[PDB]
Amino acid sequence: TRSSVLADALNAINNAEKTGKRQVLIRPSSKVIIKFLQVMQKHGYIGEFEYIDDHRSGKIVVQLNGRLNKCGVISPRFNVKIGDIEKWTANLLPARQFGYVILTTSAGIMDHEEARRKHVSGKILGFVY
């Protein structure tokens, strides 16, 4: 059985870019998936996506141009106290200049920089760079 639908979409995207391709259909388009694909386009790692409507769980077609090195999901949605968010960025982000480590908080899914801006925290979702 599929366990973390987010991963089955993220990994396909990562696979789809080193393949050279610039389009990939991801399944099965969860609400969390769209609220993640949204944050990536907010920083320009992907382009535009379209929510196909099967009468089933869904489908998404996302166009990525050339800018993502590694998108990823963190399986245990580890709870991150605001005091150790820096500890994550350090472990999985190329440099403190760029790259965002998305997470889920009470204030809604948001990247780490936006999370530090609003001073709110939650569990970690993944990262993108």
Partner RNA sequence: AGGGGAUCGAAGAUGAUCAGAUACCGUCGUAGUCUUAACCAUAAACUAUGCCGACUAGGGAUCGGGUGGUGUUUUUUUAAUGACCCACUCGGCACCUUACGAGAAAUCAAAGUCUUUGGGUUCUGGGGGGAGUAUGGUCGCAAGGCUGAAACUUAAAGGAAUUG
Instruction: Give yes or no for residue 72 binding RNA (CB under 7 A).
Output: yes
Single out the segment in contact with another protein by CB under 8 A; choices: 31-39, 70-78, 81-89, 106-114.
Answer: 70-78
Instruction: Give yes or no for residue 44 binding another protein (CB under 8 A).
Output: yes
Single out the segment in contact with another protein by CB under 8 A; choices: 20-28, 33-41, 101-109, 111-119.
Answer: 20-28
CB 109 within 8 A of CB 127: no
Q: Which DSSP string do the residues of 33-92 spell out, in sequence order?
A: HHHHHHHHHHHTSS--EEEE--SSS-EEEEE--S--S-EEE-SS--B--GGGHHHHHHHH
> What are the residues binding RNA (CB under 7 A)?
1-4, 7-8, 11-12, 14-16, 18-19, 24, 27, 69-70, 72-76, 78, 91-92, 94
